Amino acid sequence: EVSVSLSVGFKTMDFPAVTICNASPFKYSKIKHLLKDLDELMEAVLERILAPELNLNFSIWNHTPLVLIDERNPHHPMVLDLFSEKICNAHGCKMAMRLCSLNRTQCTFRNFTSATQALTEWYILQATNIFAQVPQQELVEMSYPGEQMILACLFGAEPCNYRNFTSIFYPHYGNCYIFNWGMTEKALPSANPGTEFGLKLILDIGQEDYVPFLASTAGVRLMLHEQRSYPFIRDEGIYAMSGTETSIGVLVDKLQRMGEPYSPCTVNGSEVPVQNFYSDYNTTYSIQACLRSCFQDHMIRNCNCGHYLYPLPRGEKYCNNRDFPDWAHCYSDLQMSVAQRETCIGMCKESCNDTQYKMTISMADWPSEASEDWIFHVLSQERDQITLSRKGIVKLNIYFQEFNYRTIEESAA
Amino acid sequence: VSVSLSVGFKTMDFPAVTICNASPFKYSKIKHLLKDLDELMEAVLERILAPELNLNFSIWNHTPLVLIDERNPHHPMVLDLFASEKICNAHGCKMAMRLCSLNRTQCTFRNFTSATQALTEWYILQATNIFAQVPQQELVEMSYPGEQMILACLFGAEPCNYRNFTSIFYPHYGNCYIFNWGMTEKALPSANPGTEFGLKLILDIGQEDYVPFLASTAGVRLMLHEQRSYPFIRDEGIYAMSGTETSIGVLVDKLQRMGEPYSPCTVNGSEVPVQNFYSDYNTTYSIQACLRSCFQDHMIRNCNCGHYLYPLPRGEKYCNNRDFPDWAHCYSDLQMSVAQRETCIGMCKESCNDTQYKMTISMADWPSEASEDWIFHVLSQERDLSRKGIVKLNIYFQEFNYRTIEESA
Amino acid sequence: TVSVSIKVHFRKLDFPAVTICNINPYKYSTVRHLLADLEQETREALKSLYGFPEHRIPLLIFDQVVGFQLCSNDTSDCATYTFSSGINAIQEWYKLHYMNIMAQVPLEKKINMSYSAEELLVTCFFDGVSCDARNFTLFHHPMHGNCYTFNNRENETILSTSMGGSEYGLQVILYINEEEYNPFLVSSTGAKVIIHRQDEYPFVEDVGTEIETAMVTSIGMHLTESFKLSEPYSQCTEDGSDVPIRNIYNAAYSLQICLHSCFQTKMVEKCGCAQYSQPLPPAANYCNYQQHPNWMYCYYQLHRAFVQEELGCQSVCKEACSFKEWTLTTSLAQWPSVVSEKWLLPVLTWDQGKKLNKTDLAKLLIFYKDLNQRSIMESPA
């Protein structure tokens, strides 16, 4: 038998680890030399849809071509490759990707009701087939640098620099910068609430240099997490707009359970059967890392290659249309299999420390119209340089609320 | 002792709501005091923005900005702003405020890596040193008046105006206006959730009249708090964005402690020496008000003057570089002094009831494009205005409007 | 005495019902034929009072201070409302007359005049697979017109989330036709959304989070439950089965449903007619100026009594013992980005079948941040 107890208030503790990413994975001016064939084909696809009355690298097209499927005639539904001459958008018509495999002898569609989503998903798949062929230490160089992003930083009263952030390549968002990770330095504590004693940032989005067909949303991604824990920012993260001062008040809501003799959770990675592919980051155990390692294991066994959005064990290769032609078919098969998702859930233990950095988020315009000129003129000098604009700059404060913890804990009777 | 936790909805007094403009003063009203500091701030920007390009050196000498250059560890050096004229921004170069005392025979630095932070903090100190010399009865006349701030007010369906708000002067933010404070009238109860029964405000930012080099965020400061408590806007307040309708759902979250036989907390302020108050009103006790009120005792012992951002005794004086030249350094010593921190934290004590108002924020563009031009014509006619100069603000109870944690023996 | 305990689970998780509304209830050009006289009178009032170029209850001026008064029949008394701003005068007077016009129009016609699901929804996408206007249920609300509910329809199994995060939740793009807004009723441009149980009434007029156009709104959420004990331990009910009040919302019991049902019943007692803002109780009529010419003052008195708890509703209705909540984390970003406007807006208007303006659109993401379901249980010792 276990008895629960509850504690609430303010306590001095390590300030959360904050990870900053840009909403675009790459700098278009630095990666357009790889994507030019795909961009020319994407604009030809858009012209075929939008302006049909008006050569291309069809080796890209034949990987997963988009098809119109027209069912306006129940006795003769007809499927047509995109390549008056109008494509159908009536109530009986849908748009799909033809995912073919085994020398194309047997294959299936992935279906969309709308062209905007069909084109988004098609381009993401094709761009992934291109990025998976670039070595990661070169792929890092055509993403956003800490020099460009972190215009100013100040923690409490201590000045700060982009060299205070640990850098990782999170393949869906490119380079990400982690403040106060507590990995190779001692983590910073704080002992007072309010913005005056918190993290103060000014960030440059570089919005005009986005990849046009990937970066549909503009802002930074943010995530608060424990020291020495991996930032799964595609699940947990929030956005922040440019042109505003965003203020985030943090409260650490924690729930601590008893271990194996009382519940099936774990305090370590031990006696979990899944091989942890995030181990090379030296991070602490997490159910999220276990689930993704389980998926990447199934991927490496069924497709014979690993997917680009996940880490990779030492002997394997990422999936390419050049090396592994069937990869898109088998990857969609795995990605959509709910039985596979439940298998990983049934295989990974969850950790006994559940913790949530609860946030109250508020916003206002920044700079004011009166204090605009001199702030942008001075911000232009904060780098070795001018290429700056209001639509690019975020002002961001992160701080502890008056009560900064709520802990619920189990104890043995 | 052991607690019990509960959540629900009940009829109760609506929060007190403090409305405050982001800029503390109207530039058109105060720029005659700040002229000689603005002329110097323009020159300080010339030597940073366009270094290849008459000064009041008495304003500069109070706390210069200096370049600290330590790229060459064998010979690190510090230089006043007053192969190139360019001040270095590279890694290893810091821009810092030279705080000094005793005819500059002792000094200390406040370090910044970024020039936009250094200039913001330099000006705010030099401005503060000027406001401290204006009597509050006159300094309150240079800030935004209530009748210009509150354009329209409606509580559920009861109409209100700027005269339903209690005026206070909070030196960091200028005039603030408090709704439903319960100080000179009975507080209003609210018995329904949702926006239709909440407080509905239309507010004017007056953005064309902000001070250029100070208070550089555009919006209204906002705080929800208890009846008859003083609003510490800085610490638990938020901003609200202009050009939008901001909707704020409220939940009253409480902690009730067991008291003396079990804990050191107090029922009211009668046990504690809270001598200094921000205003003449009979506001309730709080540990936050005690710590701030205690800091000023130690600063009036040590620096012989009280700080502008803090309360003041009945007959003492605010700090000026005219009367108290060393005050700028002396204040920075007190912030770092462990003895000052630990002695006030020892004097003050928690309250038995501990209430916090939690908020859920949402936003939408306002007005609608269809109602925009009759809205702004009516608001223009009634002053005898533009989208990004106006705020609409709704504050209402959530479906569950209280959460309580109660200690028991 | 009782023992509290906490059970946390990680497993595939049912998705809530999501009710989405436009802030504006009807496409104005469609209702303008009903509201033509009221628009004429309102523009005459604006031209009379404020020079703007542009019958039982007139608009008035007082020693300018502008207002109106609501009067009783069997005595000389009236409740007089005087506003220090013309915006409140005009908006509140217009809404009085608007609600007394719309209360007389038949529901069959109101449902046809408001938005269709194919108009409100440009795209929908859930769990990585396509979704369509046919996946939403109609929810007609008297102050928001046709609202539409995701993941709540008859004889279909509830949709469940087996993967957390933004990519596998509900993603929907909304068309918010702001050139067809009503000039005097609706002064805020956007949409609203409620997250609720499948058997729970959304009350989208009260507590809905608001969606801004030219923006992507990212509603990440966690699930938490609480289970209290009824009597002897607490004066609380698991169901509506043992409270005297009749439920009129055709939805599972909750305290606000009980309080509103009690008040709507007290109105059918005292004023002889039902308030149009709320569902119609059995065998009643909505109030309007021609059949119930003095209901304004009756409602005023009755609600004043309710706030002073004189009607008993607050003591008769009880808290519900089982409680489920989704703790939302709303956050916003600009959408489309300035580089993606070049192709997103053309393809979005092709997906409708003029070019869309960036401010006519809003993108909404609703997702479980993680599959962790917390619960707090109370049990006898």
Ligand SMILES: *[C@@H]1O[C@H](CO)[C@@H](O[C@@H]2O[C@H](CO)[C@@H](O)[C@H](O)[C@H]2NC(C)=O)[C@H](O)[C@H]1NC(C)=O
């Ligand atoms: C994608 O859509 C296509 C077309 O609607 C589906 O293909 C049809 O599936 C039915 C049921 O198996 C068959 O009877 C038809 O003959 C198919 N038509 C064609 C042209 O192949 C397909 O099943 C859908 N696939 C997915 C994964 O949604």
Ligand SMILES: *[C@@H]1O[C@H](CO)[C@@H](O[C@@H]2O[C@H](CO)[C@@H](O)[C@H](O)[C@H]2NC(C)=O)[C@H](O)[C@H]1NC(C)=O
């Ligand atoms: C704003 O202040 C006015 C008074 O200046 C309040 O009006 C009074 O309201 C009470 C009821 O609460 C009446 O008995 C008085 O007769 C009213 N006086 C006048 C002169 O009308 C008004 O209620 C206040 N509004 C709010 C929302 O607080």
Ligand SMILES: *[C@@H]1O[C@H](CO)[C@@H](O[C@@H]2O[C@H](CO)[C@@H](O)[C@H](O)[C@H]2NC(C)=O)[C@H](O)[C@H]1NC(C)=O
């Ligand atoms: C949206 O509604 C459609 C139609 O009710 C659903 O279509 C069914 O989807 C399942 C797989 O999820 C198929 O096995 C059925 O054959 C489909 N029926 C028809 C008539 O096509 C669809 O699942 C719904 N999608 C969502 C996300 O709710």
Ligand SMILES: *[C@@H]1O[C@H](CO)[C@@H](O)[C@H](O)[C@H]1NC(C)=O
């Ligand atoms: C098509 O584009 C790819 C890059 O995406 C390139 O490697 C290939 O050589 C191109 N094919 C032709 C025929 O130009």
Ligand SMILES: *[C@@H]1O[C@H](CO)[C@@H](O)[C@H](O)[C@H]1NC(C)=O
């Ligand atoms: C986990 O929870 C227990 C609860 O007592 C706590 O002691 C421990 O520090 C928490 N964290 C880790 C990493 O074990």
Ligand SMILES: *[C@@H]1O[C@H](CO)[C@@H](O)[C@H](O)[C@H]1NC(C)=O
């Ligand atoms: C400089 O400014 C001070 C106010 O701080 C003023 O008293 C003095 O007269 C000024 N001197 C000159 C030369 O402008």
Ligand SMILES: *[C@@H]1O[C@H](CO)[C@@H](O)[C@H](O)[C@H]1NC(C)=O
């Ligand atoms: C504190 O809370 C209790 C709750 O019953 C109340 O009676 C009391 O008046 C409140 N205030 C003080 C100062 O104790």
